[PDB]
Structures are given as structure tokens and as C-alpha cells.
Design a binder for this molecule. Sequence first.
Ligand SMILES: CCCOP(=O)(O)OC[C@H]1O[C@@H](n2cnc3c(N)ncnc32)[C@H](O)[C@@H]1O
Length: 641
Amino acid sequence: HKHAIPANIADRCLINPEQYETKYKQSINDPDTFWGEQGKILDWITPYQKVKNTSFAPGNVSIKWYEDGTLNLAANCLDRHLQENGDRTAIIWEGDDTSQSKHISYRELHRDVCRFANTLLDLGIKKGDVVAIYMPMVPEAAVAMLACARIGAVHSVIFGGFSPEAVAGRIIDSSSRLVITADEGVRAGRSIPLKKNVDDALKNPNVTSVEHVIVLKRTGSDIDWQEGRDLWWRDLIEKASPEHQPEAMNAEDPLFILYTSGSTGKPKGVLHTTGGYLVYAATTFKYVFDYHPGDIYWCTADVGWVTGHSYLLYGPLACGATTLMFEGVPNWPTPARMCQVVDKHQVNILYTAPTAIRALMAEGDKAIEGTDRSSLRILGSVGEPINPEAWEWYWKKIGKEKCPVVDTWWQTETGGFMITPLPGAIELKAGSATRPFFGVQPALVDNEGHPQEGATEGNLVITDSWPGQARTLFGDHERFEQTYFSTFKNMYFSGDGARRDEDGYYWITGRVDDVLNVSGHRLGTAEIESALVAHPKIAEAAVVGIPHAIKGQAIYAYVTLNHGEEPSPELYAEVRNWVAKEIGPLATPDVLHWTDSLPKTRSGKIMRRILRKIAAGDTSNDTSTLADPGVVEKLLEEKQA
Ligand SMILES: CCCOP(=O)(O)OC[C@H]1O[C@@H](n2cnc3c(N)ncnc32)[C@H](O)[C@@H]1O
């Protein structure tokens, strides 16, 4: 059953049950009045008059919010906080090594953002240029992102764990003019070779657009240097003026691109504009985490993911919050690390991932030994379904049974929270994301697109726009419409399945398309398959996900070798290492299943449902449409070994 709203939260909450009901209704009945007023969470240089201007219609997918208005993201996240709060900490940085930490005030962060903005301008970067950021979890990554946004450059942040090949791919598609990186990242007492990875990427003959690499000397390690191209971060920023006046950007000027894995093909650049995105990030942050001035807030997500964009940086700083950036991992040196960070910086709001929760839960009270945790008032969960038992352990052990847990469902494409509890408004069910946010109209449809009413399950769609919605796929608006708006006409299709219960609470069950969730990472089965087939011994591959107690899903790859090739344990590790090279360690198959028995239909289609079942440990329960039905038996045998 339900968790009641505690008394401490009821007494302070920004949105109560009744305000949620009232605001939700208006957001839906009158978007223009609702978002017109809510848009004032931001400072606008010239005020908007238009609010909502959107369509999901076939051939006319067009999303626009606050369009005739102008603003600066960096002014909203920095400059406007200066007069009264310049001395308030903007970012608490906690090093992988706990002996290393910083408190960076709004004034401090502003100064460096201005210097770096000038640094970028002097290097020839202009409004609209794409800048590639390949950084570890250090404050300079934020400086780099905020400075791009200040001058209307379009940053494209590349998760540090991506391979040189994956970096090349993102740089090529985006025509990035500059790469910003560090010599090495530090994670769990170990180096990560970032700049070296950038060198390798830039040797790709198809990379033609990068003019400079800016390098942060994080570790001081010996690295290669290309004279002319490579520039030290300190060398540049020390030469730069701390004076920079922000220019008005139009609400619909592109702000960033984020490569995101899909059901088809290689990752695409999901694009966000400026006004609606930032309004939505600030609004969701404030109401869902119940942010009050003085609250120390910690989102654990990496900067290279949308959660790190919206909920580490943009949402929090637009609201004048203290946000915490942690360089390392929540269980190094010990499982208690996460709660040690909480104690050390008196974190009041913690927002993390079920993969982490499961990792700490496996260690039991080792995750909490010698720690206090009393500063916490709110907990959050993101990025993957959370099982009830994990949710209960998190609520009990980290939250001391005193903290609401906000399970926030959303996606790169949605820009901010979509279905989520509000801590003082909505009673909680372990495992449920609960109710839509203001502006969000979800529905469940069957495979044919008939809407399902009452307590039911189906494909999760959103039937109208909301300020934070992604506007396009970089350089390919037609693929944007086809990818999201063609399956169920006039609706945004998320690619998730969900059930809705008798209370109207949504329970998100995961992707219904060919998209995996591995340790919280969204990866397409097809991109793993291509990476596998690029191997000169591999003929065919079929990749499925299997349940995994820790990772949520593990990657299971059926692999057909070229005629004349035999498997080995040598080849096992080789092929795993090959995928880690093609994409990154995050996409390394957990299982390689050597076979010549892929179930192909008369047409040649791969019978993917059978492969899924077999990989999952099913041994029983159509084979008639199938060239050689005997493959199923062979597949089972091989699985049993
Ligand atoms: C939210 C930041 C991560 O965004 P990405 O675009 O990388 O992945 C979005 C997908 O993560 C899952 N997902 C995300 N949050 C939840 C969630 N809270 N519950 C269940 N599944 C979730 C859903 O399948 C979704 O389609």
C-alpha cells in the first residue's frame, strides 16, 4: 500500500495535494495562462507574448514555446544570483579523493564562465557552432557548458566512458569545431585516458571540423601534444577577460545536443532549445525536490547524460541552489562513500540511480556504517525501473524512513520530469512513478494505437507538448518525426511500456522497442550488433537483453562466425574487447553465445522473441514460419552450456 506524506514535509511543502490538483488541471485546460505565469521563474530580456505553439500532426511536427521572447541561460544560472547571493556556494565539488574538495561561489563560477566565454570567442567560436565536451566530473566541465550557453554556442557533451571510435562518430555527425577535454579523469583511485582517447578519435580520416583541442591539466600526466591544435585550459583562461556581457538568445535558439541510442541505427543528437527547456528544468527541479533556499542538493548523475544537464547543473543553478558535483563513485573506497558525502556536505536532497541503490543494498549495512544521514529530507530515483524491495531499502536505510522518494520517469527527449511524485502532494507506492507533472498528458495505447482506459497497460504515449520537449534530431527533422511521431499518429511515442492502476498511478515497465537499459545506460541492440559484425571473424549477431540483479539488464549476444572460424576463449575476450573499443566498456556483452542456429524466417527476418526467451532461461513456450525449426532445439542446448 501507500506511504503517507510525513508531517515535516506537509509543513514546508511548496505544492500540497490540492495545489497539485489545481495546477495540474490548469496546465492542461489553459497551457498559455499556466506556462505564461510559470515562465516567470526565469528572467527574460525581452518578454514573450506567445506561450504554446505546437503540433504533432503528420508532416507538421512543430514545437515552440515562448517563441517571441529572448533570454540568456547563463544569466539565469549565474548573473541574476550575484547581487544578493554571489557569496552562496553554487557548486560543492567532492574529489574521488575526499582530501580534495572545493566550494565554488556564484561569483567565483560567474567569473570563470565569463573568462571562458571570452576564451571561446577569441578562438573564433560563434553562436550556433557545436562544441564537443569530453570531460570528467570536475567543475570546469560545468564552466565549459555554461560558457557555451552564454555565447549561444551549442555544446555536445560526450560521456567520458565512450571509446575514441564513439567520440569520432559524435564529432563527425555534429561538425564540432572544438573539443574540450582533460589529460585524464580520476575515478576510484585510477586514471581514465581522456586526451589520449581524443587524439585517437581525431586520427579518424572522416573528422574534418575540429580546429582546436582545449585540455584541462587535471592529473599532470605525460600526454601527447599536437602543436597548434592543442591548448592548455589554464594558459587560455588566465589570458581571458573576466568581463563578459550576456546577449539575448531567442527562446528557440538551439542550446545543446545529446547523442542518444535508438531502436534503429547509431545514436542521434537529441536537440534542446533554450526557453522552454530552462523553464521546465527549473520548475521540475523546484517542485519535485521541494527546493527551499539553503537546501544542499546532490544529483549523482554524470554530466555526459541528460540527468546531469537538467538536474546537476541547469535546473539547480537557475533556482540559485547549491548543487554538489562528485568526481568519483558512490562505493569507493567503501560502500559507505555515498553516505559519507551526504554527512560531509550535509546534503538535504539526494537524487541517484537504481543501479547504484542495488549496488549499495547488496552490501547491506556496509552502505551506512559509521554514517549519520540525518541532514536528508528528500530522496530521488531516476533512469530505470526500481523494484519495490530496492525502493523500500533505499527509503529505510538512506532516508531513515523519514524521506519521501521521488521516482522520476522521463527521457533525453523530454528535457525534464514527466511522471513523478511531488513529495508534499502525492502519497507514494514503492516502484511507481505515480502521476504526470504539470503540462504532461500521458496515455496508454495498444499495438494498433487504440487508447486504453482505466486500470490497464500499453504503449506509453504523450498526447500534447510540454515546455521541455526536445525540438528535433540534429540535422534531421524528418527522422525526428518518423522516430517519435509516426507509430501512433499525433502522439509522442516514448518507446516505453507502462501500466496504470485504479488510482491513476503509472508503473513504467521499460522499453518495448529494441533499446536496452544496462546499469542505467540506454543502448540500442542494433548498435551492439553492428559493432559485433564490424569484427572480421563475425558474420552475424543478434543482441538481446536479459534480467540482471545488479545491472537491471545484461547484454546477451548471439554470434555467428564466418565460415571456417572456430570459437575460443581467446576469441571470447577479444570480441568483448572489440565492442568496448567500438562503443565503450558500457556496451561490453555479458554473454557471447556462439551459434550457427539463428532463427530466420522464410523471408529472412530474425525471430527475436525466441532469442529473448531462450537467453532469459525459458525452456518451453510459434515455429511454423521458420526455414529450419530444428534451430530452436540447438539454441536451447547451447544455452544450457
Ligand atoms: C531519465 C534520464 C535517462 O534518460 P535516457 O533517455 O538515457 O533513457 C530514458 C529511458 O530510461 C528509462 N527510465 C528512465 N527513468 C525511469 C523511471 N523512473 N522508471 C522506469 N524507467 C525509467 C525509460 O525506459 C526511458 O525511456
